């Protein structure tokens, strides 16, 4: 959807982060200019987005602009993806997970958590839910499961009925917002070390299933939260982000065939990416000169 027009439904948003302690000491010039709620400029000719989020924008502000709508109709049987993009340091991980237990500094995923268990708990009623989550990285084109260090190079089969999935990826049923937090921690705790996260894609899946206890009828929704690896140029390739780009721009033209198979990632996410779905990309940029290099690359990744 009652708040989603058209097969996609790709929105691109642009969070600029504040200059940090280093950058201010150094005396970094500050390059971006903000015309309105959607436009940003550097040197010349604009970039237009669904939304621009200047340094001042709070997490709670970011959540409402990017996630809250997606959350509502996952609870109504639809699939959704939220991407965080940008060079290393831009604030992708600030945006997606934040400080998990500060009520003010926590990012999207914890906020999605609290949100979910609040629609659910203002009602049931006759609705009984099963919420399971999967947490896995894609490093060097292999699918490492962050919930089970046994599993690396996991395999992408295509289901029964046409569309891809990830065989035998650990699932972990949760039932409180903090149990959702736990799974993020568990994975951070299984996650390889030696920057490593700076060079691998994090996929966080929240699978909500619900059944009516009388009518018996049931809905299923999937919400993927993805923390993409830095887009900079200066642990390899990252043709991946190009496959991603290829998919998005394709959807947003109204051709007919979409380069899903071009990467493991766009293969997996295919059923939560395009058509009936919502996909919001949060591209994250630094306002410094010292990163204007990538800032502009990052900026035109979208269209």
Ligand X SMILES: Nc1ncnc2c1ncn2[C@@H]1O[C@H](COP(=O)(O)OP(=O)(O)O)[C@@H](O)[C@H]1O
Stretch that binds ligand X, among 15-23, 172-180, 213-221, 243-251 (CB under 6 A): 15-23
- Whole-angstrom distance, CA of residue 88 vs CA of residue 252: 27
Q: Which does 17 bind (CB under 5 to 8 A by kind): Mg ion, ligand X, none?
A: ligand X
User: Based on CB atoms, which residue is closest to ligand X, 120 or 229?
Assistant: 229
Applying CB under 6 A, among 8, 80, 91, 245 the residue interacting with ligand X is 91
Are the C-beta atoms of 29 and 289 separated by less than 8 Å? yes
Residue that is written with structure tokens 């990017």 in the block = 66
Q: What is the DSSP string of 17-45?
A: PPP-HHHHHTT--B--B--TTTEEBSSSS
Residue 32 has which token pair?
């971006």
- Give the shortest CB-167-to-ligand X separation in angstroms: 29
Reduced to 3 states (helix: H, G, I; strand: E, B; else coil), residue 292 is helix
Applying CB under 6 A, among 8, 32, 80, 86 the residue interacting with ligand X is 86
Q: Which does 91 bind (CB under 5 to 8 A by kind): ligand X, Mg ion, none?
A: ligand X
Applying CB under 5 A, among 39, 57, 69, 93 the residue interacting with Mg ion is 93
Interaction residues for Mg ion, span 132-191 (CB under 5 A)? none
Eight-class DSSP state of 36: T
Please report whether residue 92 would count as binding ligand X according to CB under 6 A.
Answer: yes
Residue that is written with structure tokens 């006759």 in the block = 126
- Residue count, binding to ligand X (CB under 6 A): 13
Give the residue from 74, 77, 108 showing the smallest Cα distance to 177: 108
- Chain residues binding ligand X by CB under 6 A are 17-18, 20, 86, 88-94, 198, 284
């Amino acid at each position: 959807n009652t708040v989603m027009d058209l097969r996609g439904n790709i929105k691109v948003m642009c969070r600029f982060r504040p200059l940090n302690e280093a950058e201010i000491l150094r005396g970094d010039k500050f390059i971006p200019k903000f015309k309105g709620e959607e436009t940003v400029v550097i040197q010349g000719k604009p970039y237009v987005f669904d939304r621009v989020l200047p340094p001042n924008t709070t997490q709670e502000q970011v959540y409402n602009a990017c996630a809250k709508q997606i959350v509502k109709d996952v609870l109504e049987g639809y699939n959704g993806t939220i991407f965080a993009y940008g060079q290393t340091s831009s604030g992708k991980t600030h945006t997606m997970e934040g400080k998990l237990h500060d009520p003010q500094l926590m990012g999207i995923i914890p906020r999605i958590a609290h949100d979910i268990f609040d629609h659910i708990y203002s009602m049931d009623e006759n609705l009984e839910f099963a919420i399971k989550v999967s947490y896995f990285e894609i490093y060097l084109d292999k699918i490492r499961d962050l919930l089970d260090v046994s599993k690396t190079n996991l395999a992408v089969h295509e289901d029964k009925n046409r569309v891809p999935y990830v065989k035998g990826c650990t699932e972990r049923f949760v039932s409180s917002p903090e149990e959702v937090m736990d799974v993020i921690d568990e994975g951070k705790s299984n996650r390889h070390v030696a920057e490593h996260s700076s060079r691998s894609h994090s996929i966080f899946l929240i699978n909500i299933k619900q059944e009516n206890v009388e009518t018996e009828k049931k809905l299923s929704g999937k919400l993927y939260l993805v923390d993409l690896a830095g887009s900079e140029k200066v642990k390899n390739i990252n043709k991946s982000l190009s496959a991603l780009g290829n998919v998005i721009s394709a959807l947003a033209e109204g051709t007919t065939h979409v380069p899903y198979r071009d990467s493991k990632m766009t293969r997996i996410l295919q059923d939560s990416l395009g058509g009936n779905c919502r996909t919001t990309i949060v591209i994250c940029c630094s306002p410094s000169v010292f990163n204007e290099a990538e800032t502009k690359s990052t900026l035109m990744f979208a269209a």
